[PDB]
Each structure stands twice: as C-alpha cells, then as structure tokens.
Amino acid sequence: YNPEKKEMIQEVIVEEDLEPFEASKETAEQFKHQHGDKVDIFEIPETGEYSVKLLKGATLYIPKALRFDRLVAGQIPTGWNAKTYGISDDIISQVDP
C-alpha cells in the first residue's frame, strides 16, 4: 500500500471484440456463465485449453490510481517481527498480524 498510488478499477464497456487468450476449461466456463452472449469459448483440440473471445458490449474493469492525501501514520518500527520474540512460522502465516 503506497497512499500516493491507490489501486482502483472502473466498470467500462468493450467497443470492439478483443483478441483470444488461453485459460483452463474450468476458467473459461466461469467467463461464459458471467458474460453469456458477450463471450465465446472453444476447445483448442491439441492442448485441451480454451480460447476466450470477449465480444462487443461486454463489461470490463480497468485499474487506475487515486492520489490520496494522508501520507503519515504512527507505525511500529521497521524490522519488528514476531520471529524475534519467539512466535513460530506455522502461527504467523495462519493469523492476522
């Protein structure tokens, strides 16, 4: 998280059909169930992977960057780690810091 650089997305509308990309059978079907008429999917016979033609009138999210204005916070000093106190790795990854 860089407060000068905030990830955000806008709902936009596709004006012209995209170029196909590769995805798994499961993945492709997830697109088809979402968009329906506004996407086509095809078995690529050799691999068994699927092409995804996203079509005109489909809905997309494009990332963009808000310039935010609260740049300062009272922060626990750099290099603080639960390791140094004696907490084990199995506990750290499982749990909210």
Binding site: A82, K83, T84, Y85, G86, I87, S88, I91
Partner: peptide, 8 residues
C-alpha cells in the same frame, strides 16, 4: 529469541 513459548 524465546520470550514467546507456544505451550504444548
């Protein structure tokens, strides 16, 4: 680095 001891 053993202030914390996970009790068995």
């Amino acid at each position: 680095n053993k202030l914390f001891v996970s009790k068995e």
